[PDB]
Amino acid sequence: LSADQISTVQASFDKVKGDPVGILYAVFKADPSIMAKFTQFAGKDLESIKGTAPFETHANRIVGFFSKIIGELPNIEADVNTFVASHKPRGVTHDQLNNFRAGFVSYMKAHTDFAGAEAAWGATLDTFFGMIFSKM
Ligand code: HEM
Numbered sequence: 001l002s003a004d005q006i007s008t009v010q011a012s013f014d015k016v017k018g019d020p021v022g023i024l025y026a027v028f029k030a031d032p033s034i035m036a037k038f039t040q041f042a043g044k045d046l047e048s049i050k051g052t053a054p055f056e057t058h059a060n061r062i063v064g065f066f067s068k069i070i071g072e073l074p075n076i077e078a079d080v081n082t083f084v085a086s087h088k089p090r091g092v093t094h095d096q097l098n099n100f101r102a103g104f105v106s107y108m109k110a111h112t113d114f115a116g117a118e119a120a121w122g123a124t125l126d127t128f129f130g131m132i133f134s135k136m
Pocket of ligand 1: 033087098
């Protein structure tokens with residue numbers, strides 16, 4: 001992960017960072033078992049809650065932290081540690097983590113011309129999920 005790739009990803013992310021709700025929707029759609037861990041959304045129709053105030057509040061927190069991480073590449077270890085601390089006890093699995101990744105990338109491919117940032121994003125996400133998977 002070198003500066004050229006970091007700048008590419010951060011330029012790419014800047015285009016979509018104002019749409020937290022959309023990104024969280026894509027994740028929940030890729031894997032409903034992630035959605036079922038939120039007491040506030042479990043048992044509800046994703047298409048119906050996507051435009052409510054609770055969804056936006058959650059989305060802003062979750063994508064807000066992801067935004068922190070993208071902004072500080074590559075010095076992400078401390079934040080990954082915090083992530084593991086809050087999520088390890090919720091029983092998040094590797095399967096779910098990989099569906100989060102798949103959902104995010106599906107979002108990016110449907111909303112931007114992703115072809116030019118694809119390798120840089122690959123490097124970033126392989127590094128990030130690489131660290132998470134070493135810790136939980
Ligand atoms: C893919 C598996 C994941 C599952 C099952 C999951 C589940 C959850 C749950 C249950 C909460 C608590 C919601 C609440 O009570 O209000 C939460 C909050 C949060 N998640 Fe995740 N999450 C996942 C992935 C991630 C990832 C990849 C990030 C990195 C951006 C992340 C960042 C956050 C943040 C910042 C919060 C709010 C702070 C907190 O309560 O931990 N989550 N998530």
